[PDB]
């Protein structure tokens, strides 16, 4: 198989700056001038769109800010200047040999100024406690960049088992991220401890943001 390796896996580019995506093939995908390298753009909830065909030819309705280049085993996709609706997944693809293959994909996002999270904590609802369960929820909303660290503490001791995290996609309006952290316990273990704490460490500060509540 002709294996396509894209670089990087994800990329954050400021509006007006250059986005460059690389694709390397384990074998040549060109035959006598003709290039069998294609690029596809895909946005969430939408099918892939043919963006570049034959290495350097513009797809239908593709603006001049997109350009493809390369030959043989090394190809590149350039977007400049970056605009807000260019955020998408980008894939290289070859049709020279069966099986047809795709690159692993590159997630292009918008780079904006760093922003600290807005953190909220919520105790288990009375309805869930009646069912026998106990979930504690922590929202970390509207921060940038995406990676963030959440530490749960029960009576001051860190709790890692039973924690599930989920990041939203980048917001199409302010380019921030949000994340939920959910700690699920049994009702018995929940009622055996007093203080519950979600601690958020984000590169905006070395001091963590701490939200807490007593089960009281």
Partner 1 sequence: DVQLVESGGGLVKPGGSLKLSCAASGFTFSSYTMSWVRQTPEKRLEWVATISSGGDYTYSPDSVKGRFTISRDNAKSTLYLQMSSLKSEDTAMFYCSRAEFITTATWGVYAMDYWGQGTSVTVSSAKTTPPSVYPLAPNSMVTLGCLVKGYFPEPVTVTWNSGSLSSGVHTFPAVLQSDLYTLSSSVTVPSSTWPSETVTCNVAHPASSTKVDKKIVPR
* Residues contributing to the site for partner 1 (CB under 8 A): 33-36, 38, 40, 42, 47-50, 53-54, 57, 59-60, 89, 91, 93, 95, 98-102, 104-105, 118, 120, 122, 124-125, 127-128, 131, 133, 135, 137, 139, 141, 164-169, 178-180, 182
Minimum distance of partner 1 from residue 27's CB (angstroms) = 16
Binding at 72: pick from partner 1, Mg ion, none (beta carbon under 5-8 Å per type):
none
Structure tokens at 15: 């509006």
Minimum distance of Mg ion from residue 111's CB (angstroms) = 6
Name the DSSP letter for residue 168. Answer: P
Nearer to Mg ion, 120 or 168 (CB): 168
Structure tokens at 86: 């260019």
Cα distance between residue 152 and residue 131, in whole Å: 23
The contacts of residue 130 (CB under 8 Å, 6+ apart) are none
Binding at 139: pick from partner 1, Mg ion, none (beta carbon under 5-8 Å per type):
partner 1
Sheet holding 66-71, edge to edge: 4-7, 19-25, 74-79, 66-71
Binding at 54: pick from partner 1, Mg ion, none (beta carbon under 5-8 Å per type):
partner 1
Cα distance between residue 124 and residue 126, in whole Å: 7
Nearest to 43 by CA among 8, 86, 93, 105: 86
| 3-state secondary structure at position 127 | helix
Among 2, 30, 62, 109, binds Mg ion (CB under 5 A): 109
Minimum distance of Mg ion from residue 48's CB (angstroms) = 22
Binding at 12: pick from partner 1, Mg ion, none (beta carbon under 5-8 Å per type):
Mg ion
Nearer to Mg ion, 30 or 109 (CB): 109
Alpha helices of the chain — where are they, by DSSP H?
126-131, 187-191
The residue ranges that bind Mg ion (CB under 5 A) are 12, 109
């Amino acid at each position: 198989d002709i294996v396509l390796t894209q670089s990087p896996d994800s990329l954050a580019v400021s509006l007006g700056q250059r986005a460059t995506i690389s694709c390397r093939a384990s074998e040549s995908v060109d035959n006598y001038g003709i290039s069998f390298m294609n690029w596809f753009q895909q946005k969430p909830g939408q099918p892939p769109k043919l963006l570049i065909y034959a290495a350097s030819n513009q797809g239908s309705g593709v603006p001049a800010r997109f350009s493809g280049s390369g030959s043989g085993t090394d190809f590149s996709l350039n977007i400049h200047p970056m605009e807000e609706d260019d955020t998408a997944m980008y894939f290289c693809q070859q049709s020279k040999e069966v099986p047809w293959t795709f690159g692993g994909g590159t997630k292009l996002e918008i780079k904006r100024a760093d922003a600290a999270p807005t953190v909220s904590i919520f105790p288990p609802s009375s309805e869930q406690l009646t069912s026998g369960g106990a979930s504690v929820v922590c929202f970390l909303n509207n921060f940038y960049p995406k990676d963030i660290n959440v530490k749960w503490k029960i009576d001051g001791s860190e709790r890692q088992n039973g924690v599930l995290n989920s990041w939203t996609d980048q917001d199409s309006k302010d380019s921030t991220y949000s994340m939920s952290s959910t700690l699920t316990l049994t009702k018995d273990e929940y009622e055996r401890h007093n203080s519950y704490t979600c601690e958020a460490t984000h590169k905006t500060s070395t001091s963590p943001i701490v939200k807490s509540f007593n089960r009281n």
